[PDB]
Structure 1
């Protein structure tokens, strides 16, 4: 019969623009993940030119199902072109999330994807930090000032009112300058420092969030203060030594991280890491199966690959809220 179409403005109007809906949504989805009440096939990458092509040039299909009270299925179909911002003044990433009624498997919603994606990704850092950051941490570091960085920063400030300073670095000086200028105005009672190198930024963060497009690590273990928590959202930034030297290593999904061509799998393929070495999956922290941070000296790394259930749960929550406020465009399927 019908589907609800929700563009980015619709998603914002329905609450998608505040970290809290994503935090609520992921707390629930990560709970279902610890209880194994979900299905989540490996996400395939479509690259139009698989080797002759930049690694941020792909479109990823991300299907998942989450069981429970209000069981939902769906897919995030999210594209990327590295030079969308530099060459076309367009956001790098774009896409759609489709939601499906598990009774019929019929599609019931078509939604813009990149706001939800950046926002659920920021919620991952928020929930991880609730468990893995020093309580009361004052100093946050953001590396990379694109859309992901922006949303990470927004959500952390919304969710942690004890943050006092924010150290920012970007490889592109100008990007950094505009970003801190923007944010110093958004939040005047917080001190934003544009740093001159990555080391200065990292060294000064109690929470360090990576939001770049690198494929060569630059973060060294010895940059990290005792008691640091690093949320390695952009994956490639952290040197291998950090996975080895960190007191605790958390992932979102071990199976999804032990992929052939992955840093963790490589350390495992050598004799430098195992599943036994892994401290926890994130959902296990949420449920209290495994403890989070245990002292203020531990250096803790989160390596989160990204999980379809995060997109699907978030979108479902926003879909319901939109329907509640009569937001969106009703489409006929037939």
Structure 2
């Protein structure tokens, strides 16, 4: 019995370094989600300090099974220390994805997780923007210049050739400076603007993507242009009023969002939100059960907690491409 090991370099070589593989994988997984052909138990958070602990110091286990023609199971096991970049010069998040053959349940692949996690999260923004952003939008905003922001930006630019300007803000000015400098050279024909505050960045974006590590909301509803689509990838950035005031609120998975201690659950627990109030789950937009944007004045909020089936589908596509190209290291289980 063997397993394929794919490090981040191997993942890049097998196509994991381009958005399209993730967009393809997620369109499939989200269709399976809409058709309920998956299983996704709740994610446990392992924290060393469940009391007295930074919200981004954790390891999350994210198991899932996707059914269908090419059923697959697996887990993403993804750790985080808020401190890693500033104190250790290391990426915040790290970890592994294990894929399992659903016939036998045996593990068949062990793969590095963080590039795939970041790219599938960027693909979530792409697919949602296809349904929820103004068609042909020109102005993109990125808040937070870490690995998630970098990939969000890369993928949007790969997937939307009409983007003209990119407003970028980070609380840490130097991170923003270097981020825009790097990108300005990567893409000379797009105009990147390092902004002075978040309000300037948010106010000027037709699509706004949050990519920070914060536990306190700063994005106000009146910052948002009519017609804006906000992909709230880092979840906590957005004031509650935005959930209430947006014309349409979309999540990836309601049961995961309407979960004890979370923003949506809190509005629900008060009498300020419900499932009736929710516009769609993302998969329902992909499959066409529910329409997306219907006019260009609508302000639309996506609040995606992240779903294990996204990681597992992404990793499975990449595993397959790697096997096709004989990329990776064959390990024996026994």
CA distance in 2, matches of 1:132, 1:90: 35
Shift of 1:5: 0.2
Alpha-carbon deviations, 1:86-125, whole Å to 9, x = none?
0000000000000000000000000000000000000000
State the secondary structure of the residue aligned to 2:109.
strand
State the secondary structure of the residue aligned to 2:99.
strand
State the secondary structure of the residue aligned to 2:167.
strand
Match of 1:146 in 2: 146
Match of 2:26 in 1: 26
Unaligned runs of at least 5 residues, structure 2? none
CA distance in 1, matches of 2:285, 2:7: 33
Shift of 1:52: 1.2
Shift of 1:220: 0.2
Alpha-carbon deviations, 1:189-225, whole Å to 9, x = none?
0000000000000000000000000100000000000
CA distance in 1, matches of 2:251, 2:257: 8
Shift of 1:49: 1.1
Q: TM-score under structure 1 normalisation?
A: 1.00
Unaligned runs of at least 5 residues, structure 1? none
State the secondary structure of the residue aligned to 2:110.
strand
CA distance in 1, matches of 2:201, 2:133: 17
Match of 1:280 in 2: 280
Q: TM-score under structure 2 normalisation?
A: 1.00
State the secondary structure of the residue aligned to 1:105.
coil
Alpha-carbon deviations, 1:140-193, whole Å to 9, x = none?
000000000000000000000000000000000000000000000000000000
Match of 1:108 in 2: 108
1:126-141 → structure 2 map (5 Å cutoff): 126-141=126-141
CA distance in 2, matches of 1:138, 1:203: 14
Alpha-carbon deviations, 1:269-311, whole Å to 9, x = none?
0000000000000000000000000000000000000000000
Shift of 1:82: 0.3
Shift of 1:51: 1.4
CA distance in 2, matches of 1:53, 1:242: 28
CA distance in 2, matches of 1:257, 1:51: 22
Shift of 1:259: 0.6
Shift of 1:228: 0.1
State the secondary structure of the residue aligned to 2:209.
strand
Shift of 1:64: 0.1
**Paired positions, count:** 334
Shift of 1:56: 0.3
Shift of 1:53: 1.2
Shift of 1:38: 0.0
State the secondary structure of the residue aligned to 1:201.
helix
CA distance in 1, matches of 2:259, 2:120: 22
CA distance in 2, matches of 1:316, 1:260: 31
CA distance in 1, matches of 2:193, 2:40: 40
**Please, what is the CA RMSD of the aligned residues?**
0.2
CA distance in 1, matches of 2:316, 2:285: 23
State the secondary structure of the residue aligned to 2:230.
strand
